[PDB]
């Protein structure tokens, strides 16, 4: 274990945050692409 938090809320969905480096930009920003590298992560579900 690392930490425990008494948040006291219900959670049904979650999302992953990924840090990206701006490979290049465009004027009048149209959400140009970034680069972090292969972003390889797993996700699993626990059961009783």
């Amino acid at each position, epitope marked *: 274990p690392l930490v425990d938090l008494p948040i006291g809320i219900n959670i049904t969905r979650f999302q992953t945050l990924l840090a990206l480096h*701006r490979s*290049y*930009l*465009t*004027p*009048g*920003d*149209s959400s*140009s692409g970034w680069t972090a590298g292969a972003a390889a992560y797993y996700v699993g579900y626990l059961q009783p």
Partner: antibody, heavy 125, light 105 residues
Framework: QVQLVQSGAEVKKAGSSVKVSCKASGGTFSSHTITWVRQAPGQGLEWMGRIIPILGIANYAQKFQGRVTITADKSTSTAYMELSSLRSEDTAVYYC??????????????????WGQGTTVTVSS | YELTQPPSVSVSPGQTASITCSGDKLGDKYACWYQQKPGQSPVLVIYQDNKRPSGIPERFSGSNSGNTATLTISGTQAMDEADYYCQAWDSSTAVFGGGTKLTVL
């Protein structure tokens, strides 16, 4: 997307308070640091400063120390500032622009993505 | 911190134009070059290192040397009449130079 449309030219007497503002009407007012740069004929560009709406921290320029009072309010979704003690030599065209970022150390990783049409000001004496 | 550049530059159309924006310790500072045309507002063409943003035609180019920044122009046309201003975010402030006016015969 954002347009940063502002008011047109204004005529006023010398020595009076000068008020100018830029309104987006496009994308969100926040999330986009707004800076003002002055364009003059045969004198290059002059940098005034920048104000971050969400952060609320305003940075001043060396020559504009104490002559500008920049304020921004999220509720009104408009950025306006006050100017005083303006001389005829200081008359020029003012422009407003966005930086796409709201972090103090991240402006260098960006540029003035969009500019305004320019609001020329004339001083009558 | 202080920027000094030639007042103007002239070059024949279709040639390679090299513009030098000299200063004091401007290498490794993320300089930015802007373009302003007569009757049109300034636009962004270079960002953070000689970097051409996608959507602008790939006619501008350049590199940042130890103590000098250079801009290379390819496929110059008549419409390229504009003024180039080189600036950088130094000491949490922006400094704008005199700028150069490009002349085409």
């Amino acid at each position: 997307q954002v347009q940063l449309v502002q008011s047109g030219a204004e005529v006023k007497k010398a020595g009076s308070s000068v008020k100018v503002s830029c309104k987006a009407s496009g994308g969100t007012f926040s999330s986009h640091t707004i800076t003002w740069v002055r364009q003059a004929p045969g004198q290059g560009l002059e940098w005034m400063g920048r104000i971050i709406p969400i952060l609320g921290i305003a940075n001043y320029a060396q020559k504009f120390q104490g002559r500008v009072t920049i304020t921004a309010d999220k509720s009104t979704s408009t950025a306006y500032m006050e100017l005083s003690s303006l001389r005829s030599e200081d008359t020029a065209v003012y422009y407003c622009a966005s930086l796409q970022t709201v972090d103090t150390a991240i402006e260098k990783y960006y540029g003035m993505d969009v500019w305004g049409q320019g609001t020329t000001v004339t001083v009558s004496s | 911190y202080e920027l000094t550049q030639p007042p103007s530059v002239s070059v024949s159309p279709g040639q390679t134009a090299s513009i030098t924006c000299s200063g004091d310790k401007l290498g490794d500072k993320y300089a930015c070059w802007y373009q302003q045309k007569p009757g049109q507002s300034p636009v962004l063409v270079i960002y953070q290192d000689n970097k051409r943003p996608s959507g602008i035609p790939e006619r501008f180019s350049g590199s940042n040397s130890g103590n000098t920044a250079t801009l290379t122009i390819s496929g110059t046309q008549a419409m390229d009449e504009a003024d180039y201003y080189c600036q950088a975010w130094d000491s949490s402030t922006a400094v704008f130079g005199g700028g150069t006016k490009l002349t085409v015969l």
